[PDB]
Design an enzyme around this catalytic site. Sequence first.
Site, PDB file in Angstrom:
ATOM      1  N   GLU A   1      -5.902  10.659  12.468  1.00  0.00           N
ATOM      2  CA  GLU A   1      -4.144  11.272  12.059  1.00  0.00           C
ATOM      3  C   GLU A   1      -4.582  13.164  11.772  1.00  0.00           C
ATOM      4  OE1 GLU A   1      -1.539  10.059  11.899  1.00  0.00           O
ATOM      5  OE2 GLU A   1      -0.347  11.499  10.591  1.00  0.00           O
TER       6      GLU A   1
ATOM      7  N   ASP B   1       1.422  17.632  -0.559  1.00  0.00           N
ATOM      8  CA  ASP B   1       0.087  17.947   0.105  1.00  0.00           C
ATOM      9  C   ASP B   1      -0.832  18.098  -2.085  1.00  0.00           C
ATOM     10  OD1 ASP B   1      -0.475  17.027   2.438  1.00  0.00           O
ATOM     11  OD2 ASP B   1       0.325  18.182   3.008  1.00  0.00           O
TER      12      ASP B   1
ATOM     13  N   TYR C   1       3.618   3.646   7.708  1.00  0.00           N
ATOM     14  CA  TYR C   1       2.965   4.882   6.959  1.00  0.00           C
ATOM     15  C   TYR C   1       3.387   3.943   5.503  1.00  0.00           C
ATOM     16  CZ  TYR C   1       0.038   7.931   4.397  1.00  0.00           C
ATOM     17  OH  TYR C   1      -0.426   8.546   3.597  1.00  0.00           O
TER      18      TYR C   1
HETATM   19  O1  LIG Z   1      -5.966  10.726   1.434  1.00  0.00           O
HETATM   20  P1  LIG Z   1      -5.152  11.382   0.700  1.00  0.00           P
HETATM   21  O2  LIG Z   1      -4.456  10.754  -0.293  1.00  0.00           O
HETATM   22  O3  LIG Z   1      -5.349  12.629   1.058  1.00  0.00           O
HETATM   23  O4  LIG Z   1      -3.660  10.915   1.260  1.00  0.00           O
HETATM   24  C1  LIG Z   1      -3.610  11.875   3.134  1.00  0.00           C
HETATM   25  C2  LIG Z   1      -2.782  10.586   3.753  1.00  0.00           C
HETATM   26  C3  LIG Z   1      -2.528  11.815   5.215  1.00  0.00           C
HETATM   27  C4  LIG Z   1      -1.932  12.646   5.265  1.00  0.00           C
HETATM   28  C5  LIG Z   1      -2.642  14.217   5.287  1.00  0.00           C
HETATM   29  N1  LIG Z   1      -1.259  14.843   4.511  1.00  0.00           N
HETATM   30  C6  LIG Z   1      -0.052  14.547   3.986  1.00  0.00           C
HETATM   31  C7  LIG Z   1       1.242  15.433   3.921  1.00  0.00           C
HETATM   32  C8  LIG Z   1       1.944  13.568   3.361  1.00  0.00           C
HETATM   33  C9  LIG Z   1       2.088  12.551   3.680  1.00  0.00           C
HETATM   34  F1  LIG Z   1       2.796  11.512   3.945  1.00  0.00           F
HETATM   35  C10 LIG Z   1       1.002  12.052   4.590  1.00  0.00           C
HETATM   36  C11 LIG Z   1      -0.369  13.190   4.370  1.00  0.00           C
END
Ligand SMILES: O=P(O)(O)OCCCc1c[nH]c2ccc(F)cc12
EC number: 4.2.1.20
Lengths: 393, 393, 262, 262
Positions: D49, D60, D175
């Site tokens: 991803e 973010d 997702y």
């Molecule tokens: O592990 P964490 O909590 O950083 O989630 C990141 C998931 C992948 C992710 C990175 N940036 C994003 C921005 C919007 C979104 F809907 C998903 C993501």
Amino acid sequence: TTLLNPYFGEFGGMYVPQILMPALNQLEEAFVSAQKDPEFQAQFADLLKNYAGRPTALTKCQNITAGTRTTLYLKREDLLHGGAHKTNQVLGQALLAKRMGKSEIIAETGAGQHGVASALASALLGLKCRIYMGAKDVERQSPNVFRMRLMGAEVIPVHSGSATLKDLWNEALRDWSGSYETAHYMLGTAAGPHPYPTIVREFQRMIGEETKAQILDKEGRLPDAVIACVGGGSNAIGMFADFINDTSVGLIGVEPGGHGIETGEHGAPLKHGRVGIYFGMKAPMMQTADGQIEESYSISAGLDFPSVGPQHAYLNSIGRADYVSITDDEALEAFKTLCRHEGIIPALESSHALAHALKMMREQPEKEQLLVVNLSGRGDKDIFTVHDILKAR
Amino acid sequence: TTLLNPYFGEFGGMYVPQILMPALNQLEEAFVSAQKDPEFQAQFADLLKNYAGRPTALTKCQNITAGTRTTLYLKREDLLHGGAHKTNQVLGQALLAKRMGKSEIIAETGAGQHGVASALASALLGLKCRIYMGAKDVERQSPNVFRMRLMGAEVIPVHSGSATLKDLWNEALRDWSGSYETAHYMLGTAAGPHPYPTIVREFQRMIGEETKAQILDKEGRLPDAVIACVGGGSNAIGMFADFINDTSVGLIGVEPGGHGIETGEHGAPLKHGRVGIYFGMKAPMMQTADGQIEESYSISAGLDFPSVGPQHAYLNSIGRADYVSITDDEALEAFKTLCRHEGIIPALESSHALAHALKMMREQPEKEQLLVVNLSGRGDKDIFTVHDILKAR
Amino acid sequence: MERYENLFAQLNDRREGAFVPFVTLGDPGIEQSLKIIDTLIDAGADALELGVPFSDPLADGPTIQNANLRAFAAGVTPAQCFEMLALIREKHPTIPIGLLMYANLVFNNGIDAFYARCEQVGVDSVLVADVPVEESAPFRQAALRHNIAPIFICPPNADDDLLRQVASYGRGYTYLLSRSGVTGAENLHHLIEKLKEYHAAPALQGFGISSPEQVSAAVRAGAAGAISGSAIVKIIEKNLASPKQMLAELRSFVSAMKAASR
Amino acid sequence: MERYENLFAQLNDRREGAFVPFVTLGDPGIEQSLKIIDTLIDAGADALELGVPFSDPLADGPTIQNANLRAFAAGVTPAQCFEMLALIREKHPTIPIGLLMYANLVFNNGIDAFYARCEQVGVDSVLVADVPVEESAPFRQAALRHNIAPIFICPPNADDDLLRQVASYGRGYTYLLSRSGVTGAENLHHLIEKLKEYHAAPALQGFGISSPEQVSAAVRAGAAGAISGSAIVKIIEKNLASPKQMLAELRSFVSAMKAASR
Ligand SMILES: O=P(O)(O)OCCCc1c[nH]c2ccc(F)cc12
Ligand SMILES: O=P(O)(O)OCCCc1c[nH]c2ccc(F)cc12
Ligand SMILES: *Cc1c(COP(=O)(O)O)cnc(C)c1O
Ligand SMILES: *Cc1c(COP(=O)(O)O)cnc(C)c1O
Ligand code: NA
Ligand code: NA
């Protein structure tokens, strides 16, 4: 001789050099004919409404009287153009001047509020304006200075004395005593020689007349008391004048107590000073035992005139009005309280009135009372002052 | 799905993470029921009149159009409580929030005017308010900071990015995307995702409705044009909305030209930017060729949102409204001219509209035209800015 | 007493105008002021016009504002002024002495008491600069009960109504204002005539008189003499650090103005 | 292609959840990012991803906001991102690659053209974080015309109306948002069930997943795997000045999360 009585009881009079009498009597005569002149009236009314923004709101406080039986209204002169009630009377006096054929205006200021108000009225009306200000306030009241010159007004630095209101006032009179044929002296408060106390009152009296109509529409009855701060006396006599014959309405004037009456550093001549002759009138003033005129002290620079209007000294002596004092600290507490609970930043002058009203509510919380506080101005101009005091604690 | 059309032509929409849709649709549904709710209406009207001071004066300029055939009126939002037209809609949105059962309000600000307005409305209405502000503006917008905390509001310093409106806006959305169940996000202009462009317009539309009644009483006819500055678009759509079907009235929106369109340093996305998707909408915005969002520049910090309301992009595309730009220097000249000839200090935002109106009058001085300039705010807050620029020359 | 009647009898029998210097009492200190006054008299002053230090001299230009401040710097008070005044009258028995006052100082402890103290110390007249004729009743009554002449200003803009009041109420001398504005060395036939027609106390011209031709001219216009203040105060001002010179410069200005009165 | 169908066929025949790391492309520089990605894959990542540096990452948290800024500090642009992407697909032929985009970057030069460029470089899916299902028509249509799976977020507050749209429109993977707020290592049965009932692309859980038990748990709840970003970005962040250590720390986090998927 005069058309109107220059005295309120024993106070008042025309104590100026003989050279200035004719200017005063000429000013009295023009005011009397402008008062019965419907064109004059219509013209002053139009500028007050389409230009200054009247009538001002009468706002009911919601959060500050919570838990008491006080209902509190604020007459919103803070919303007038210029942010203070002084705009009402400089407009009137500037028209008067034009009506006399004068083309120049003399004013003096300390903090600079009357200075700003004379300069906007003169800018609007086509008058050339010169303002005496202390050489030091020019250094610290740069913001106000800059506003005045932005308005086309000439600012004249003074170094004679301490640059205290006393010397600004003298500097301005001296100049008028040489140029009264073309200049009109725009006195800033309801004090000074006749007919000034009477003219500034009549030109401020729409404050009380609107409040009376507005409280009567919203509550169906006159207030128990209207409260106002008193530095020279114009917002207060403006608020009081229309209720003077409504004998059930208390009229309360609040002078600055400064650091506290006991210290000597206050600005409450009306109740703690002695009749003297100065500022062209006979009134209570701060003075030494030797008769030298002294300063008034207050956290608000706008309440420092060391004497007080003669109609206030006379309303007090016959017991129609009551005068009290409020210290700097009490006025600062009221200032923070109005910002936090109503979202209105009040001038620190007006905060003295509001602190008295809060004390009335707080001392006797189950007394049922309808109070109107004259919010004479807005307190954006005091923000640094309150900040710095607050920084220091 | 929605009750109202989220698009004005191709512009608008709801481009936010899926997690925020429910909050938006909930906000849309509460606004629609508050709009047909007579209690709601009566309550918003009462606060606007007894608390904010409406209706504002419609003042006829006397001295500035001397020698031309332009008659110029200024709609006096500078006299509203808080000194700017933003008070109208934060009052409405704060009621809405209460109507939704929210108890907290999120707002963001740069210069600090929307911040001050959210904090006074929240102080009045009993809401807990948190405001994002740049870590640097806190250093320079101390005056506004101090006002907000005087009002009980929590000010939250941001260090992500440049602390430009862009990052304040993102910081606030991020927080809302975690606390929308209890907090209401009080967007500051008529932009952002639906239904925000529609709600801020309806809550600002009394500007144009009063001006129409007031010009009709004073001149007996609609203006030739109403002119307003455009930073995000709310004072302007507030002024325009009621005249949109009066097809003889021109609607002119004035964006900041900054240092000049040719330099690249301006804040006129509507006419010089490119459709993009950001701020939850599809609208013209300042952006690189690569699609990175950029800054808007203007001598007034209040005109720097780098995008513009979607109903303005749509009024421009079908030709109902015209949008122009005014540089910093032109806005400063209009600012000095209004102080000197009318005694009114205008916000530097509003000075852009006024400079466009002056240019119309000055370019064709014998054209007979009735113009209304939306004086969106007062310029006490810009005094140092204008002084310092003026010191430097 | 009748010091002014008598002095004007004497001056008229020798066809001379009066020359009257004004100084602030106690400027720049008490002893120096006492010596400045003896020098004035020694130099030919026919009478004295003396200012009592007041906090707000609103009818006074800067030279005299500065003489008020110097006096306060020295710590001079009204009380000290009266002691000085009794020392002057004990040394010079027949010179007419007039005070220039502001109202608050006369009113402060009782109007009648202020004039009783003038009478006991030997003052002959008092002029209150901010009391117009219209407010003067209480002042003029108390002066006449203590044998003090109440002096009034006859301003350039006087109408006939004022001329008559000034003539009826004033005694000793009529103060003839040379122009508008305030005292200051830097800036009337018919008035004179009407005053004599209405039997006003002899006029003395003042405000702006700074040179000897001016003195000659006032007398020629019919004024009975001239007062001069700022031009004497300036001399004190210039020579503050050299006292001996101060008296010698003063001595010479005075005799020159005095000799011009003849 | 069908990289996700095939990878999920493979994983299901070995009863394993997918482990999918998120990193910002070009963080902290292009070569280092290329090496971080090879290490991720080497360490067991079943799919990638990948974030394209955007100026306003509004969904973010700070860890990733900081990864966007580092990327810009390095001068990474969308263009450089696509070249990197073609270098990744040339080295690793069968790993599914998905992009995490913000809308303005997809729309900027033409929605259909952005998806044509994904197809030419070998990307398998795209998730546009600020395009809700309600605005997604133009986006999902262009993705399906270029054989790109359009990925949608199934948020914690989803109603049944949304569940059905997500299942009908999404392809590749669903997702599954673990909570409200934003990405950030510092902060669903029924959703899962309904998704399978409505025949949604296999779900992948994300937002907040930072440790190996979490991975095991998601698979147990029925999610087909988990995505993790902030916890991988933090490792890059910590070891910025020691690259060798950065890969060795990364290698170990990944295999631990991967081994937890079994
Ligand atoms: O592990 P964490 O909590 O950083 O989630 C990141 C998931 C992948 C992710 C990175 N940036 C994003 C921005 C919007 C979104 F809907 C998903 C993501
Ligand atoms: O010479 P000149 O110009 O300083 O005038 C002084 C005349 C005597 C004098 C001194 N101070 C005064 C204040 C008021 C007033 F009516 C007269 C005087
Ligand atoms: C000037 C002023 C005052 C004091 O003047 P008054 O003549 O005593 O009314 C009070 N409040 C404000 C806000 C002022 O500007
Ligand atoms: C905030 C502000 C503006 C700009 O906001 P819009 O939403 O574009 O109206 C303009 N004028 C003043 C005085 C403001 O405070
Ligand atoms: Na006072
Ligand atoms: Na903009």
